[model samples]
Target: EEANPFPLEGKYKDESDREHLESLPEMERETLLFERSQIMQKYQERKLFRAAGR
Candidate 1:
């Protein structure tokens, strides 16, 4: 089965954000990615929950 594509679909942020991500020290980069993963996972969970009602 295919994984959902919704979360990966958008060029939703400006270059400055990616620029900021790139500027982080190695440890900070990992920390930022960890939190971002949490945010994206929560978004996916909510999207699935809402879709199941219909």
Candidate 2:
């Protein structure tokens, strides 16, 4: 268990399946990859905010 609650916990998949991504069309695959990156960026910022104690 994590001491701090993950901002995207239970809301997003913890991992993306490589085979699933490969099975998707090129555009769809890129779109999902992009979304994941954006989600990850938000999570990073959230972590920074928590680390700053604010």
Candidate 3:
């Protein structure tokens, strides 16, 4: 990550989904977002856990 933004690369260490969405067709990409959203949820949960522990 950077103070600016992320670009398509490897492991997609920084929101690869956002970078890749444009490549896919509309319907398929929309479906992907549903699953992709879970990934976001997991990260948010981890953040909450870390903050609570501290």
Candidate 4:
């Protein structure tokens, strides 16, 4: 019923994905962007609903 905000120390905090993307083609990189956008959607939702305290 509840979820924590995105963690700074979480896996996404690491830039290995980006580093790997450096050598990747637009096909997968574009997909990664879409994935990031999805995460950002949840990120903003948590921020807005959590009263700005956590």
Candidate 5:
């Protein structure tokens, strides 16, 4: 698996950050996660699959 290069820095490096993120309105949280998932999916679809298979 690819490493997470910038895995949560500074203030975001704590459990509190997770608490804060979880505290966000449900819609906001879902939107953010969905957006990230979409980007990752696109990246794999466009690059990783082709590079590994070929």
Candidate 6:
């Protein structure tokens, strides 16, 4: 399977999906926020791990 370049795979599945996700109810929008937090946490973790090895 092709890797998902974007953080949220479901949201980016189609144009309508993307639009619907963008307009998600406040509570439902948490998925996007969670994905963003995960991305940030992973980025920092990788950066630190790489720096420690250098």
Q: Write the per-residue lDDT of candidate 3 for residues 1-54, one digit (tens) a residue.
A: 112122233223366566677578999777766665666666667767878888
lDDT at residue 38 of model 2 (Cα atoms): 77
Candidate 6, superposed: residue stretches over 4 Å from native = 1-24
Per TM-score, the best of the predicted structures is 1
- What ranking emerges by lDDT with the best candidate at the front? 6, 1, 2, 4, 5, 3
6: Cα error in model 3, Å: 9.0
Among the numbered candidates, top lDDT falls to 6
**How well is each residue in 1-54 modelled by candidate 4, as lDDT tens digits?**
244332433324446654675567999777876776788788767768776665
Question: lDDT of all the models against the reference?
Answer: 0.63, 0.62, 0.57, 0.61, 0.59, 0.64
Ranking according to TM-score, highest score first: 1, 2, 4, 3, 5, 6
Candidate 1 lDDT, tens digit per residue, 1-54?
A: 224433332311456666777788999878977777776687778778878876
Winner of 1 and 6 under TM-score: 1
The segments of candidate 1 whose C-alpha lies over 4 angstroms from its true place after superposition are: 1-12
Worst 10 residues of 4 by lDDT: 4-13
Per-model TM values vs. the true structure: 0.72, 0.64, 0.56, 0.58, 0.48, 0.47
Ranked by TM-score, the better of candidates 3 and 6 is 3
Give the per-residue lDDT digits (tens) of candidate 2, residues 1-54.
223322334233433566566688999988987887776777667778888885
What TM-score would candidate 5 get against the native?
Answer: 0.48
**What range of 10 consecutive residues in model 1 has the weakest lDDT sum?**
4-13
- Candidate 1 global CA lDDT score: 0.63
| Poorest stretch of ten by lDDT in candidate 2 | 1-10
